[PDB]
Amino acid sequence: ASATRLIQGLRNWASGRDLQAKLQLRYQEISKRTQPPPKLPVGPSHRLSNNYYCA
Amino acid sequence: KTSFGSLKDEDRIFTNLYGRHDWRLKGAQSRGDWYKTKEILLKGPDWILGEVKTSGLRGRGGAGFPTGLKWSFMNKPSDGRPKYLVVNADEGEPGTCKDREIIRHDPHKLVEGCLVGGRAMGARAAYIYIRGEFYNEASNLQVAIREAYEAGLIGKNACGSGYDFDVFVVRGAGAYICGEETALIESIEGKQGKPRLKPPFPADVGVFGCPTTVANVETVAVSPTICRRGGAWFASFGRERNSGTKLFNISGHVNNPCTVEEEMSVPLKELIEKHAGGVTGGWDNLLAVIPGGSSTPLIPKSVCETVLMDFDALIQAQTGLGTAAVIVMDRSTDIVKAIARLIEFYKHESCGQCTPCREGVDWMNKVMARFVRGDARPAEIDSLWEISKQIEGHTICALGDGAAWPVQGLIRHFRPELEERMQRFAQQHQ
Ligand SMILES: NC(=O)C1=CN([C@@H]2O[C@H](COP(=O)(O)OP(=O)(O)OC[C@H]3O[C@@H](n4cnc5c(N)ncnc54)[C@H](O)[C@@H]3O)[C@@H](O)[C@H]2O)C=CC1
Numbered sequence: 001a002s003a004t005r006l007i008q009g010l011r012n013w014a015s016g017r018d019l020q021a022k023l024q025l026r027y028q029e030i031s032k033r034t035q036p037p038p039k040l041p042v043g044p045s046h047r048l049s050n051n052y053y054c055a
Numbered sequence: 056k057t058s059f060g061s062l063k064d065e066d067r068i069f070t071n072l073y074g075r076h077d078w079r080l081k082g083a084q085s086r087g088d089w090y091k092t093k094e095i096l097l098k099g100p101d102w103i104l105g106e107v108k109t110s111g112l113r114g115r116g117g118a119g120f121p122t123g124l125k126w127s128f129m130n131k132p133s134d135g136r137p138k139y140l141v142v143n144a145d146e147g148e149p150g151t152c153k154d155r156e157i158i159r160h161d162p163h164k165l166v167e168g169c170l171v172g173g174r175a176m177g178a179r180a181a182y183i184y185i186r187g188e189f190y191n192e193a194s195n196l197q198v199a200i201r202e203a204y205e206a207g208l209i210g211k212n213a214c215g216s217g218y219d220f221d222v223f224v225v226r227g228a229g230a231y232i233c234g235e236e237t238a239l240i241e242s243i244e245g246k247q248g249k250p251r252l253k254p255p256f257p258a259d260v261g262v263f264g265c266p267t268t269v270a271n272v273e274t275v276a277v278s279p280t281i282c283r284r285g286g287a288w289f290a291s292f293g294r295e296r297n298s299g300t301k302l303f304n305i306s307g308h309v310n311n312p313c314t315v316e317e318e319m320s321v322p323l324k325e326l327i328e329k330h331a332g333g334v335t336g337g338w339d340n341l342l343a344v345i346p347g348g349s350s351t352p353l354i355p356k357s358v359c360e361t362v363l364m365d366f367d368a369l370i371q372a373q374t375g376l377g378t379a380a381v382i383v384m385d386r387s388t389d390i391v392k393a394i395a396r397l398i399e400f401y402k403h404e405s406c407g408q409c410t411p412c413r414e415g416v417d418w419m420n421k422v423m424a425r426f427v428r429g430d431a432r433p434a435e436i437d438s439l440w441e442i443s444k445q446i447e448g449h450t451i452c453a454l455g456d457g458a459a460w461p462v463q464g465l466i467r468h469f470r471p472e473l474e475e476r477m478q479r480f481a482q483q484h485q
């Protein structure tokens with residue numbers, strides 16, 4: 001991302017592709033390393049009635 | 056006959072129910088007790104069992120088992136062991152105070168019932184297991200038993216018939232479970248009042264391991280009147296398979312709470328409005344009725360309008376007749392608090408023997424204590440329903456059934472009131 005536009009143009013010409021649109025080095029677009037806490041759902045057997053295990 | 060109730064005073068078995076006459080031997084013989092008892096004893100066990108079977112008498116303890124069929128389980132030759140009648144006088148059911156009145160006011164009627172029933176079943180003696188809280192009633196019955204021994208009516212050569220028969224009184228010590236017949240047998244034997252598993256039924260292995268019939272005070276005390284008046288007289292009252300008269304204990308929210316003898320298939324509305332002075336605030340103030348003491352499920356006002364107070368019509372009203380103890384609850388009643396107090400009774404009165412009652416009755420009391428406050432969520436209602444269904448039929452005796460049934464009646468007739476209780480808890484506490 002820090003490449004100058006001359007090197008960027010030479011690089012896009014040599015590859016034949018627009019390389020800045022799809023960079024293989026990751027930057028600020030990726031997820032944060034600290035996330036909010038999850039609240040995971042429970043399955044269908046988490047019920048207080050009609051939940052006999054033999055069924 | 057299609058309509059029932061309005062029982063005449065000449066057809067009352069329990070005259071002197073109210074203590075207005077002499078309960079002693081002169082007053083009892085002046086009212087018809089101990090009359091031609093020798094002629095009843097000399098006609099044999101088969102005649103007495105035939106009179107009790109013809110009378111249609113069912114078990115007045117609360118289950119309603121046929122009394123003559125039950126007592127004929129003892130009609131068999133001896134195998135070396137003595138035979139025993141045991142009279143269940145524990146009467147721990149909330150709402151129920153009728154056997155107290157029989158013991159306290161008609162004691163010689165109970166003693167003559169012990170003699171006639173023990174002759175019918177070939178019993179050696181009678182053990183009247185009385186409640187220990189009924190101390191004055193027990194001493195009252197002991198004075199009447201002393202009068203019956205001193206008159207030669209019981210004991211060696213009872214009533215001049217050549218049949219020897221003792222009558223013992225054993226006092227309880229404060230356990231509602233000791234009215235269940237096998238737990239009562241274990242309590243007589245000097246142990247914890249824990250019910251035995253059936254089989255053996257007490258006619259095979261009962262008190263001291265002997266053949267035994269445990270029978271209620273009321274179903275014992277009506278038996279000399281059945282033998283004198285005839286079984287066809289006693290079967291002329293009430294519906295078919297619902298024969299006779301019955302003591303009713305109308306308590307709770309009525310104007311005049313009382314014990315009254317009444318014909319069997321009397322309407323509940325007629326009984327309350329005739330003998331109890333009606334519901335406080337009128338019949339329109341009625342919320343619910345527990346028809347037969349605490350173990351029967353409640354029925355709301357819409358069921359109470361036309362229901363009959365015998366066994367079969369209350370089974371069709373998905374409750375029980377039980378002890379015929381009518382607990383009336385008006386519109387000002389916190390009905391969840393009353394049913395939860397009843398479940399609190401059933402966990403304080405639970406002998407702890409088997410797992411579903413010992414654990415689940417306490418767990419139902421905790422759930423009901425949260426349902427009173429509303430500190431719950433509606434998915435716990437059906438959960439509680441299933442908990443009751445995991446106690447019902449899975450226990451040793453029917454105290455688990457008698458604790459599951461009020462929960463089931465409360466849920467079945469008052470689920471929306473539980474739900475609005477919980478949602479107002481949720482909106483004023485969150
Ligand atoms: N009177 C009171 O103070 C109280 C009465 N109850 C009543 O007790 C009733 C439940 O009592 P239980 O005796 O536990 O239940 P119930 O089903 O067993 O039995 C009643 C009587 O019939 C006899 N019996 C039943 N089936 C028999 C069979 N196949 N063979 C031989 N004998 C048989 C039993 O030995 C017992 O004496 C309830 O309906 C309840 O209303 C409950 C609590 C207090």
Ligand SMILES: Cc1cc2nc3c(=O)[nH]c(=O)nc-3n(C[C@H](O)[C@H](O)[C@H](O)COP(=O)(O)O)c2cc1C
Binds near residue numbers: 113118125146237457
């Ligand atoms: C927990 C429990 C308590 C009982 N308490 C009494 C009682 O106090 N008095 C009574 O007559 N029957 C009581 N019963 C019913 C008896 O088990 C039995 O059915 C009855 O005493 C004798 O049968 P009967 O109705 O033919 O007389 C109780 C039953 C249970 C399950």
Ligand code: SF4
Binds near residue numbers: 407411413
């Ligand atoms: S159900 Fe309750 S009252 Fe009956 S034997 Fe079990 S613990 Fe005892």
